[PDB]
Design a protein around this nucleic acid. Structure first.
Lengths: 455, 252, 455, 252
DNA sequence: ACTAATAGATTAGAGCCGTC
RNA sequence: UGACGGCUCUAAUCUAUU
DNA sequence: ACTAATAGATTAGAGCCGTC
RNA sequence: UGACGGCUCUAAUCUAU
């Protein structure tokens, strides 16, 4: 009998001053906000690394019409939807033979072989970036199946961590992913078969690769001015360094004139040493005193109200430290996000589960919201089975729970890394997780870059 | 466009009378265990909390017959329901924590009373059924136990008590498997592997109906059911979930 | 009665292999060797300074008529010539105020004030490179006139040395260079009057802005197979530290199967303390081996011939070191380029001076060569006054001197900093000069980017 | 085709029989100077490199009358152009260095003997003619000294012996300015500025003819000019430049 | 003092599948 | 690491009661 | 011991200019 | 530093007392 308040879909803004609700269908008709001319890509891998990449990419410029769907049965060509030309021409290739990578494949020590695998990969990248007159835009690393099947800490985390000092955006693929037809499961069809979803599969590669190189594919439209979105995740470090050490990541959603700035403040804070996910007052002020200045040097003022996010609820110890370094016109407020309330909702008719966006409010402080479900714009469920509703409650300070719930929705819509209709969590935490994931792989990073293209 | 909206919660439409604290001074040693007891009770400082009488625990503890009702502390549950308790002897958060301890403890005791066999998960205990208590392997024209490939699947529930929104029983439904009914497969990976394989062939309506079917068989009356934490007082829980109001239907 | 041998101008390649001895004309008729779509250009400078750049980026866009095509060729335009797009679209700006510049300009201590000004530009350029979602191919620095008029070490040398650690191509423009019409001498015409020459002044800027960001305009076709060339300059650093220190720098000019860009193995050796410009044997092995080693990664075998171009005369104590780190089939040669030989030929008839490509051979070991003057191909005088011939003497090693003079013309062909008919000093020496000066501005360089666009 | 070329080099046709060394051992003064000597002689160690005899310098050096012809180490001039002579006393490279040293001293002596005013410099010393020495400063119907605005420019030449290709007089030409031809200006920057002012209207034909005219004035005979390296011995240097036969030509 | 305590109530990893 | 779900399985912390 | 020795011969800096 | 000529003006080094 308890009513559920429906939150209208967060509204994203496109180029030409044009405005569409969905992103990937909006990106099908209309294009990016910024024009990037071409993309001077680079490819590093084995001899077959090119052939899988050249055949795939040279197949990806044409319109690959996705088949047997109403959700997203199309892809209207790369350059047509992006107004940027980038193809097999301009592919700068560095060769990693099979022998040298093979000699690093059969090592027993996993720690050194993971570090050696990335060392040979990036040393070609670093040398090519510096000691080559031809300018690359972003690299596309290709590794074969046996590499991570045998050697794999995490190779992906180690790879991105070591390149942050040189600020060279990259991307990692595999023969299983691109040439899904090449490797075939001998006792059936290919394991990762995605032919039915192949058309909009290419949407994801075509989107992030755009973002890694000056890409501004879509922009938020419902962001109010003067509000700061500070997503604060708590990531742990365990391997080769002390387990009871917690770090932090910080995002931004400021608006300068027109335009949403989405640079991720890193300034990693290894101060928590007790294994608890809380910030000492010494560096607690360091969050805002660095973040607020970034607002000041970008806007020329201080925000009138800041929405700070966290996967873990705060305590009174932090809030006194947070507000004491803020003036009397920038009321702090602490929103905590929790994907741990396994509530489940059902409906009488239809094999379909519940639609997306219908939110239930518990009281003036707490509410439930469904980021995923039976999205109607695609006529199919975003999450096929019953999902977990997000439990968004306001912890410290005061704010209107109606708009906070809307703003959380106003964060899930964009995901430059994933060409999806809607994400299951606000990106001020999702991209916060990736920053913490990568910044923790290497331990000699100082003043790391803030742009998301490097992750 | 509007939608009737049922959930996986389970409201507590009647809460027991009051919290009874036992002045069990020197009656119990440090080495004592209470999980074996048929009634939900846990120790706090030198006290024991429950909703039943002292002699209710004497069947398994004949020594405890000397306890007198003059040494009992009574705290009203509906006082904790509003979250209005404020005392230095025990905090409201401790009071609410104490209740959810009892309700979680009470649920399994009735569960082990019912002829539904259990399973040990990572952090909680589920309850799966077996062929032998059913007609035509179905209940209320809903397939409650099925046979797939060379194995058979079993519906299961995992309920926990929460107090923040309101007194409610919060169930979690998930599938479990056996080789021939009597014995399950003792490999976690394969048991999970078959779960997704059979789980991905299901939909929203069938997931709801099986969950509701298990409660209906679990229900003791048509309108609701009573959890028999004790033989005298009980926690009554509706056999129908906490319904909601969905003011938007599907659009085409 | 002394006979003057003549060597014809060396051939150069262009798009699809064109036969055009001239570079500017060759680029006008035929595009560069590779296409690069558009160039994403960022700008840093004074607020008003941006406006004059916004004036210039369109002046380049339209064709500019220099003079008679025989005298100075016409400029078709960036899009027409380079097959690349370069305009105000995509320009990224970073405001620099004037008040802070003035307060830094009003200090008597030049050393720290010069350090302060470049730091003012640097903190803008560094942060914009890392913490920005926009891909920038090359940045352009616009410096107010008052900076170098009253407060200049040297600003340009200090600027590139520090930016070198982060690998961003930068170009420096002065208000005087661009706003020549605006700035005017009150007692006459503008001091910077180049309206007559304006046609080609755009080209050299455009060619620079091409090579700064992935530019591969032309490649000499006369490079002998399986040979390499080394330049050498002995720069000096007097910036405090020890009372004297002679530096060094070098580049390779190897060849591949089809075309070969050239980079500079600098790896500076500040070891020389006596001030005599000579290389100790310890470091000489490192230079040649690294140049010899770097050839291996490109062709797989040692180069058949390696040439050591240098402004000074090799001492016998040094040339032994080079040979002993060299295989026994790849004979070394040592040539010296000298401008301190006061010889000047004249023509009894005709008011104009001698032409290019004519050499006087004093002996099989040493010869004279002219690279500057009144060329008959465009019938204009590169040097209005009498030129000074290049002195080439094979100080060490032995090879046919006709080949060296024939090859040394090819080095004179290209100078990517200024697209002219032919450089008056071989490319391996002038490019050695700047790379030496840039790295001597600061003594805190560990590994310098090996390419040229960063200088 | 056929392009004749005239350089800025003056070959020497002839050298004297030998160069004379004077051993002033334990008999030269400690404050001995050789600059004031009217003949080109350079003193180093005990030897005195020159071409004149001992009695030639006795005019101001009566103490050199004790010198006797035995210690006159005469080195033939035939060895220099081939470098055959190799001695521990004087190295072969030193004979070339000694010869070029004394010739430049002989060169500056002859300019002082001529009525030509000097312009001293850090490395070299050009020689320029003052107006009114010859009519309208036009030698061989060729402009030599002019008056531009209030500034007058005088042609000047700097020469130094160079032997590496062959023994040749290797001369350079540059312009010098004054106020009225008698007072040098101390403004070197203006001197440079005026030099660039004068150079903005000159080309090859006027560059060579002006240099060619200047050496013609310095000629002692029709086809050469000597140097007073000795009271009876001289070096004859062609007043015409060495001709270059460039058989590759292009139109003017 | 801390001792491991047994359920809370929070927390992150991490592997595993289906599916877009 | 294409990317998103979904559970399963482990691990830890603060709160009191021992 | 080198003290500077006065020149040849090399080399680099930093100025200034032009632009047939 | 737009760039590349040409000079100017300093300075130091090595080769010989």
């Amino acid at each position: 009998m308890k009513e559920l308040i429906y939150i209208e879909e967060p509204k994203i803004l496109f180029a030409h001053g044009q405005k569409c609700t969905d992103a990937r269908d909006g990106l099908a008709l209309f294009g990016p906000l910024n024009n990037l001319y071409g993309i001077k890509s680079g490819v590093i891998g084995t001899k077959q690394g090119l052939k899988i990449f050249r055949d795939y990419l040279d197949h990806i410029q044409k319109p690959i019409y996705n088949s047997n769907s109403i959700t997203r049965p199309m892809f209207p060509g790369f350059e047509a939807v992006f107004d940027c030309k980038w193809e097999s021409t301009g592919i700068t290739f560095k060769e990693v033979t099979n022998e040298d990578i093979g000699k690093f494949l059969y090592n027993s020590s996993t720690h050194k072989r993971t570090y050696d695998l990335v060392s040979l990969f990036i040393d070609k990248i670093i040398s090519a970036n510096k000691n080559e007159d031809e300018n690359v835009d972003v690299w596309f690393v290709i590794v074969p199946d046996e590499i991570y099947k045998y050697c794999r800490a995490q190779f992906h985390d180690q790879f991105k961590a070591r390149l942050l000092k040189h600020t060279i955006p990259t991307q990692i693929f595999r023969e299983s992913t691109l040439a899904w037809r090449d490797f075939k499961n001998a006792f059936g069809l290919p394991i990762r078969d995605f032919s039915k979803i192949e058309g909009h599969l290419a949407w994801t590669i075509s989107t992030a690769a755009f973002y890694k190189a000056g890409g501004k594919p879509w922009k938020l439209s419902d962001v109010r001015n003067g509000v700061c979105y500070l997503g604060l995740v708590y990531k742990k470090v365990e391997k080769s360094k002390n387990p009871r050490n917690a770090c932090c990541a910080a995002q931004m959603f400021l608006d300068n004139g027109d335009g949403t700035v989405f640079k991720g403040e890193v300034g990693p804070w290894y101060n928590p040493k007790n294994g608890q996910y809380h910030l000492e007052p010494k560096e607690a002020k360091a969050l805002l005193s660095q973040s607020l200045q970034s607002y000041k040097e970008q806007i020329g003022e201080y925000p009138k109200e800041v929405f700070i996010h966290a996967k873990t609820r705060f305590n009174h110890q932090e809030w006194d430290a947070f507000l004491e370094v803020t003036p009397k016109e920038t009321n702090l407020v602490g929103v905590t996000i929790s994907k741990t309330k396994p509530l489940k909702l059902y409906k009488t008719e239809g094999d379909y589960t519940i639609l997306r966006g219908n939110a239930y409010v518990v009281n003036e402080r707490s509410a439930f919201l469904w980021t995923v479900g039976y999205v109607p714009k695609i006529q199919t469920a975003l999450s096929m089975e019953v999902p977990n509703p997000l439990f968004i409650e306001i912890n410290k300070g005061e704010a209107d729970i109606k708009q906070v719930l809307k703003d959380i929705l106003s964060l899930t819509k964009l995901n430059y890394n994933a060409c999806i209709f809607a994400d299951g969590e606000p990106v001020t935490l999702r991209f916060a997780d990736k920053i913490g994931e990568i910044l923790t792989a290497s331990t000699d990073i100082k003043t790391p870059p803030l742009a998301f293209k490097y992750y | 466009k509007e939608e009737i909206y049922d959930s996986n919660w389970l409201s507590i439409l009647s809460f027991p009378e009051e919290l009874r604290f036992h002045e069990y001074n020197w009656m119990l040693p440090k080495r004592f265990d209470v999980r074996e007891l048929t009634f939900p009770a846990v120790r706090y400082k030198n006290y024991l909390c429950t909703f039943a009488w002292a002699y209710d625990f004497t069947y398994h503890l004949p020594k405890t017959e000397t306890y007198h009702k003059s040494k009992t502390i009574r705290i009203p549950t509906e006082e904790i329901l509003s979250g209005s308790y404020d005392s230095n002897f025990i905090r409201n958060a401790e009071c609410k924590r104490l209740i959810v301890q009892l309700l979680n403890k009470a649920f399994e005791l009735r569960m082990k009373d019912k002829e539904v066999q259990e399973y040990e998960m990572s952090n909680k205990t589920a309850y799966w059924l077996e062929k032998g208590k059913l007609e035509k392997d179905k209940f209320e024209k809903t397939m409650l136990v099925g046979k797939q490939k060379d194995k058979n699947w079993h519906f299961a529930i995992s309920g926990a008590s929460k107090l923040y929104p309101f007194p409610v029983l919060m169930i979690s439904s998930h599938i479990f498997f056996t080789a021939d009914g009597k014995k399950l497969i003792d490999s976690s990976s394969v048991q999970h592997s078959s779960r997704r394989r059979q789980g991905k062939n299901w939909w929203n309506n069938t997931w709801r109906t099986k969950l509701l079917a298990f409660i209906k068989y679990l229900s003791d009356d048509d309108t609701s059911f009573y959890l028999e934490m004790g033989s005298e007082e009980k926690v009554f829980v509706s056999n129908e979930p906490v319904k909601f109001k969905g003011n938007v239907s599907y659009n085409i």
